Design a binder for this molecule. Structure first.
Ligand SMILES: CC(C)(COP(=O)(O)OP(=O)(O)OC[C@H]1O[C@@H](n2cnc3c(N)ncnc32)[C@H](O)[C@@H]1OP(=O)(O)O)[C@@H](O)C(=O)NCCC(=O)NCCS
Ligand SMILES: [Mg+2]
Length: 218
């Protein structure tokens, strides 16, 4: 039934909430990050971290703050990878152990057309042609955007480098998979090279959810 669980492997626990339940609070160490933030931002930050801590507990990790690094990335415990996402109607998180996977990214977007002008900013010309050829009945522009954001979230923990929308070609399959091909140098922090990612996607509840797992080194 759950969206994240439908697009990631069983060994990565996940949790998701569609509303902000009453009474949640950040951990004390997290409060400074949202002390001057509007209510919508506070709620998304707090609720998503409740989900992340639930998933962490399945791995046997007890309550821990989830702070943000220099580029906004979540700072997980040593030995853990994970990803979080929040949009109106969705907060979700997934975590895993570094002994089982290398990286994970997820992203939820509303299943609506992109705002005016955004497709031109995020798509390669060839991608625009590809999207126009896909079957009618899905907002392929929004799916592409979501998949590219997930690509960055899986890439950044392994490279510590920017990846722009123009720096990867994403090909969407109607069957619920996609691929991301990196067009820039793919050197990762540990000396390996990233060149392509395999992704999965689902549309339900008026939402798109995309996910990439970078698998354990073969
Ligand atoms: C960072 C980004 C991908 C977030 O995606 P989004 O769809 O806007 O927002 P989401 O709600 O899905 O995800 C937000 C969460 O991403 C996570 N995040 C932020 N920066 C991150 C990073 N550098 N690496 C990994 N995860 C990151 C955080 O946990 C954040 O939630 P928090 O602030 O409550 O901790 C997006 O805002 C962005 O800046 N994109 C530019 C880079 C990009 O997408 N390149 C395309 C590559 S092909
Ligand atoms: Mg999003």
């Amino acid at each position: 039934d759950q969206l994240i669980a439908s697009v990631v492997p069983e060994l990565l626990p996940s949790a998701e909430l569609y509303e902000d339940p009453p009474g949640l609070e950040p951990l004390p160490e997290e409060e400074p990050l949202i002390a001057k933030s509007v209510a919508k931002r506070r709620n998304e930050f707090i609720t998503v971290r409740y989900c992340a801590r639930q998933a962490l507990s399945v791995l046997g990790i007890p309550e821990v703050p989830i702070l943000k690094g220099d580029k906004g990335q979540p700072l997980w415990p040593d030995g853990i990878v994970g990803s979080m996402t929040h949009t109106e109607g969705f907060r979700g998180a997934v975590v895993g152990r570094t002994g089982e996977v290398r990286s994970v990214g997820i992203d939820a977007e509303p299943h609506d057309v992109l705002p005016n002008g955004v497709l031109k900013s995020i798509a390669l010309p060839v991608e625009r042609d590809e999207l126009d050829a896909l079957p009618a009945g899905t907002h392929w522009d929004r799916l592409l955007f979501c998949a590219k954001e997930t690509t960055y979230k899986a890439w950044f923990p392994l490279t510590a480098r920017w990846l722009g929308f123009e720096d990867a070609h994403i090909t969407i399959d109607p069957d619920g998979t996609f691929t991301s091909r990196i067009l820039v140098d793919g050197r990762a922090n540990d000396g390996t090279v990233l060149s392509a990612f395999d992704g999965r996607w689902i549309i339900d509840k008026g939402l798109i959810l995309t996910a990439i797992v970078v698998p354990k080194l073969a």
